[PDB]
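=== Structure Prediction Worksheet ===
Name of assembly: unnamed complex
Input type: mixed (protein and possibly other molecules)
Chain count: two
Listed entries:
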Amino acid sequence: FVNQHLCASHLVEALYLVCGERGFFYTKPT
Amino acid sequence: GIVEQCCTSICSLYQLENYCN
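=== Predicted Assembly ===
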């Protein structure tokens, strides 16, 4: 796991990996 | 939001944990 900036879908994947069961919210509002 | 902050800053899994609070 690179410790850099995460702008792409890679950020949502990484949050999902560390949270395990989607205990987070937010997506681009459009 | 998380997306905007991690676009402009480094977000290791240690930091990402804070959004799972």
